Amino acid sequence: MARGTFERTKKLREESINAEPHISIERAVLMTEAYKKYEGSVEIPVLRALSFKHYIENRTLSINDGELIVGEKGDSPNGAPTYPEICCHTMEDLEVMHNRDIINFSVSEEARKIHKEEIIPFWKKRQTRDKIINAMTPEWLAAYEAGMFTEFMEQRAPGHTVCGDTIYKKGFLDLKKDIEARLKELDFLNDLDAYNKKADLEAMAIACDAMVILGKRYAEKARQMAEEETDEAKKKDLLLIAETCDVVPAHKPETYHQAIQMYWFVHIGVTTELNIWDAFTPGRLDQHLNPFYERDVENGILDRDRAQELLECLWVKFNNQPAPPKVGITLKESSTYTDFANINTGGINPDGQDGVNEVSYIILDVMDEMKLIQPSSNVQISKKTPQKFLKRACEISRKGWGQPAFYNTEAIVQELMEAGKTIEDARLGGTSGCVETGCFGKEAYVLTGYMNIPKILELTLNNGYDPISKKQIGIETGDPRNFQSYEELFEAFKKQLHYMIDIKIEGNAVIENICAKHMPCPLMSTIVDDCIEKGKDYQRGGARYNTRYIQGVGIGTITDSLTAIKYNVFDKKKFDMDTLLKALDANFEGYEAILNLVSNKTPKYGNDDDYADEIMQEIFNAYYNEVTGRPTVCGGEYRVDMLPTTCHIYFGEIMGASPNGRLCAKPVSEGISPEKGGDTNGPTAVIKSCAKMDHIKTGGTLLNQRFAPSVVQGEKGLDNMANLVRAYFNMDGHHIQFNVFDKNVLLEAQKNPQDYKDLIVRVAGYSDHFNNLSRTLQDEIIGRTEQTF
């Protein structure tokens, strides 16, 4: 039939998939009212909290037909609020997003008028995007404009965080009492920081009051609708909603149902406080819900079916919240409606032992049934994980819509401990976003933007000149024709890297200050370890752990490029640097013999070939060494991860031909995957190549693999997938995820998209509809190596 295990969830799912993407202007209006009332009369943290509270008090609330869990970010499903305190769109922005080819958002004429007349006049000079851009150096602006790197905080708040367990043990009235206790013990005689603590703690208290009002208003809304509903079954559902909201979020949840509603209210809260990267996620959902599940079934108020029904409702709620609209580079690097709410199922419990429980299997059943691209429902696989759980996950992956990805629990824990987390805290951790490792509920781990490693080699080969933007973007490391050795070339590359990282980090530091001062998040601070105890907002270092990342893109492309140069120019001496540079400038036109050599007669990453893989390691180590351990403004350090989202398309589009044989404006490699056509020795050879990268020293790496549908059939096919995951993870690989599609279906979908509106594929760290992808991205996915066992 229709997807959904029950008639209720079938109906909720059909509403969700039919909702049209559009913008909701109410949030911007209410924030404007609050600033006009309060700006200049209070410190900024209190201003944000008072503005959030004003928004919560006055926004319109809705309950959709059949819901058991309530709460929407916008006016209706697929309605995105706007965030003019971060990015106040131009009228052209609104025109572009309404009319663009993919990832469009409808802008009603009423929304356009209000934005033009009320929002722009107030927020255009206040938006943080202008504070950032106006503070960047000309070197940063040139590099940014040339596609050397991206900037995550230009249109969104740092975000990128995961809920802990606080909201299942405390309500917001409890947290407020904790905050009031902290306020009473501030020592203004001897603690010279007491004033800053008071401002942040006062804001947190106001945020708590706002959450109490959220629950109060939804309970009223539910009862007012109950008096008006004639259908007896619906009225009882409305009365159940009201009873649930009488408890949460003001008080700690007492039941499994209340635990889910508490999480979802907090989710609505933090993602309307600010437009945070990767929305929000409960993280280790099966660990938090299992005590409630066991208690509730034992008391006879819950069974497996109702527990599954509630989670199917939750799944639909995620799918009703798009990532708010992006423009410019932010869209190019994250070209999707999804908001990367990553759920980790399986793994280990807080004591460090096997965490698979009954809720874990329920989550696998609901993600299988619902087949929704939000949330991003993934599994943590431990050496302690039962093989039955892994094989069930492989069963779902083999169906070919991308979810779940697989994460190595032992790698995650060691990555966290390498970064300074205690073993006790690391056992609560996991991955969020695409593949990013973090200590859930206790860490600010902020991604700052992608770094175009292949184009750094391009700058090296052009003495700092960018052949595409036709500007001097890098530094003068020398004419490559004078390099007498591969070591000399690699040293020049490392100098270009150092310069580009220095440029990025300097801008990052400015941006970190701007976000801390102008984007404090008192609501998020209330639920993140150490903010209350420290009296310090999450956005300026209140978390127990603080890290920042620069995301490395294109390791396969640059590995094969430097490998091609070492092999052909310096070792075998089949041609010289001058000839290679002419070939690149001509996009290999007139140099077909060179193209054949570098493409087809040269070692390649992903074949368990140490000639290429040792170069991968050298590049990886240089990147790790250049970035890791640099201080952040708010008391943490920089670390390294490797993922592209859709930025590998953009980074290749503004790059010329590269020495490995990739042609001008083609995408660079995705994640740590091999280059196009690079791996010719099967999937075991590539996981052996990928394992030579030291995953433990990163905050996560992304590996895509693709299988022919015929080679994963039957029980042997499941075992082959399961065994590949185990083999990779036994070598301490971080992550792997699978495409399993018929190439001809994708090709047909390109010719007749309207017949394939349901076709979903794996992109990079998330799944999306094939029809939401540009032709270039579609062709990138189709070109990935079709593996056989």
Short mmCIF file of N, CA and C in Angstrom, two decimals, residues 150 332-334 450-452 454 552-555 557 643-655 662 665-671 673 676 702 704 762-766 776-781 784:
data_model
loop_
_atom_site.label_atom_id
_atom_site.label_comp_id
_atom_site.label_asym_id
_atom_site.label_seq_id
_atom_site.Cartn_x
_atom_site.Cartn_y
_atom_site.Cartn_z
N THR A 150 35.15 27.66 1.43
CA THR A 150 33.84 28.22 1.70
C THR A 150 33.80 28.73 3.13
N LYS A 332 25.53 26.11 -3.10
CA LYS A 332 26.40 25.26 -3.91
C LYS A 332 27.07 24.19 -3.05
N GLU A 333 27.41 24.53 -1.81
CA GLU A 333 28.10 23.57 -0.97
C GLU A 333 27.13 22.66 -0.22
N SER A 334 25.84 23.01 -0.16
CA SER A 334 24.86 22.20 0.55
C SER A 334 23.54 22.25 -0.23
N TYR A 450 34.64 24.19 3.75
CA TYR A 450 35.43 23.24 2.96
C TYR A 450 36.69 23.92 2.41
N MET A 451 37.75 23.12 2.24
CA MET A 451 39.03 23.59 1.72
C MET A 451 39.33 22.83 0.44
N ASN A 452 39.60 23.58 -0.64
CA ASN A 452 39.75 23.03 -1.99
C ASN A 452 41.21 22.58 -2.16
N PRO A 454 42.70 20.23 -4.02
CA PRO A 454 43.21 20.16 -5.40
C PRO A 454 43.53 21.53 -6.00
N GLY A 552 38.41 18.94 4.64
CA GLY A 552 39.27 18.71 3.48
C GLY A 552 38.51 18.03 2.35
N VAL A 553 38.57 18.61 1.15
CA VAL A 553 37.88 18.07 0.00
C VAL A 553 38.90 17.69 -1.06
N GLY A 554 38.70 16.52 -1.66
CA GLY A 554 39.42 16.14 -2.86
C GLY A 554 40.70 15.36 -2.67
N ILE A 555 40.83 14.60 -1.59
CA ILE A 555 42.08 13.89 -1.33
C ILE A 555 42.40 12.92 -2.48
N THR A 557 41.54 13.20 -5.78
CA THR A 557 41.99 13.98 -6.93
C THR A 557 43.44 14.44 -6.73
N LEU A 643 35.06 15.56 4.33
CA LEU A 643 33.75 15.33 3.73
C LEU A 643 33.45 16.48 2.77
N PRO A 644 32.59 16.26 1.76
CA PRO A 644 32.35 17.30 0.75
C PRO A 644 30.92 17.85 0.69
N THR A 645 29.93 17.12 1.22
CA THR A 645 28.52 17.35 0.89
C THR A 645 28.38 17.52 -0.63
N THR A 646 27.97 18.69 -1.14
CA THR A 646 27.98 18.91 -2.58
C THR A 646 29.11 19.85 -3.01
N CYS A 647 30.03 20.17 -2.11
CA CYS A 647 31.07 21.13 -2.44
C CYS A 647 32.12 20.57 -3.40
N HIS A 648 32.22 19.24 -3.54
CA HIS A 648 33.15 18.68 -4.52
C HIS A 648 32.73 19.00 -5.95
N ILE A 649 31.45 19.26 -6.18
CA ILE A 649 31.00 19.74 -7.49
C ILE A 649 31.50 21.16 -7.73
N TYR A 650 31.19 22.07 -6.81
CA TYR A 650 31.62 23.47 -6.92
C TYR A 650 33.13 23.59 -7.04
N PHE A 651 33.87 22.89 -6.17
CA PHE A 651 35.33 23.00 -6.15
C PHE A 651 35.94 22.53 -7.47
N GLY A 652 35.34 21.53 -8.13
CA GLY A 652 35.81 21.13 -9.44
C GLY A 652 35.38 22.07 -10.55
N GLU A 653 34.19 22.67 -10.42
CA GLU A 653 33.69 23.57 -11.45
C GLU A 653 34.58 24.80 -11.64
N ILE A 654 35.21 25.30 -10.58
CA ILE A 654 36.04 26.49 -10.74
C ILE A 654 37.52 26.15 -10.75
N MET A 655 37.85 24.94 -11.17
CA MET A 655 39.23 24.49 -11.30
C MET A 655 39.51 24.03 -12.72
N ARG A 662 41.90 14.46 -14.87
CA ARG A 662 40.58 15.08 -14.74
C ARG A 662 40.53 16.34 -15.58
N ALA A 665 36.87 21.96 -15.13
CA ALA A 665 35.54 22.18 -14.58
C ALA A 665 34.80 20.89 -14.20
N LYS A 666 35.44 19.72 -14.28
CA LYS A 666 34.83 18.50 -13.76
C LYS A 666 34.90 18.47 -12.23
N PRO A 667 33.97 17.78 -11.57
CA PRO A 667 34.06 17.63 -10.11
C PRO A 667 35.39 17.03 -9.64
N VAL A 668 35.78 17.37 -8.42
CA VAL A 668 36.87 16.64 -7.77
C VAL A 668 36.28 15.42 -7.05
N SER A 669 37.14 14.56 -6.52
CA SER A 669 36.66 13.34 -5.86
C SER A 669 35.87 13.70 -4.61
N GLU A 670 34.92 12.83 -4.24
CA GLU A 670 34.05 13.01 -3.08
C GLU A 670 34.55 12.23 -1.87
N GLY A 671 34.47 12.86 -0.70
CA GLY A 671 34.95 12.26 0.54
C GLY A 671 36.39 11.82 0.41
N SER A 673 36.86 8.95 -1.13
CA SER A 673 36.64 7.95 -2.15
C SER A 673 37.69 8.09 -3.26
N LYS A 676 37.41 9.26 -10.19
CA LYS A 676 36.62 8.60 -11.23
C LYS A 676 37.50 7.68 -12.06
N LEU A 702 34.63 10.45 5.14
CA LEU A 702 33.45 10.00 4.41
C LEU A 702 33.86 9.09 3.25
N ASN A 704 32.16 6.78 0.21
CA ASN A 704 31.10 6.23 -0.64
C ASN A 704 31.60 4.99 -1.37
N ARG A 762 22.16 7.93 -2.79
CA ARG A 762 23.12 8.42 -1.81
C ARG A 762 24.04 9.44 -2.47
N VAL A 763 24.15 10.62 -1.86
CA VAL A 763 25.01 11.68 -2.38
C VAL A 763 26.32 11.63 -1.62
N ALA A 764 26.41 12.29 -0.46
CA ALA A 764 27.63 12.19 0.35
C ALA A 764 27.27 12.51 1.80
N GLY A 765 27.08 11.47 2.60
CA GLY A 765 26.65 11.66 3.96
C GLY A 765 25.17 11.89 4.14
N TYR A 766 24.38 11.76 3.08
CA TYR A 766 22.93 11.90 3.11
C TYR A 766 22.34 11.37 1.81
N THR A 776 25.30 17.82 -13.35
CA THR A 776 26.68 17.51 -13.02
C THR A 776 26.78 16.56 -11.83
N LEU A 777 26.00 16.81 -10.77
CA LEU A 777 26.03 15.94 -9.61
C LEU A 777 25.46 14.56 -9.94
N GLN A 778 24.36 14.52 -10.69
CA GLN A 778 23.83 13.25 -11.16
C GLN A 778 24.90 12.45 -11.89
N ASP A 779 25.62 13.09 -12.82
CA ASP A 779 26.66 12.40 -13.56
C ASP A 779 27.83 12.00 -12.68
N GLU A 780 28.12 12.76 -11.63
CA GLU A 780 29.17 12.35 -10.70
C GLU A 780 28.79 11.01 -10.06
N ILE A 781 27.56 10.92 -9.57
CA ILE A 781 27.09 9.70 -8.90
C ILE A 781 27.10 8.51 -9.86
N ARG A 784 30.52 6.90 -10.40
CA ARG A 784 31.21 6.20 -9.32
C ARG A 784 31.37 4.72 -9.69
#
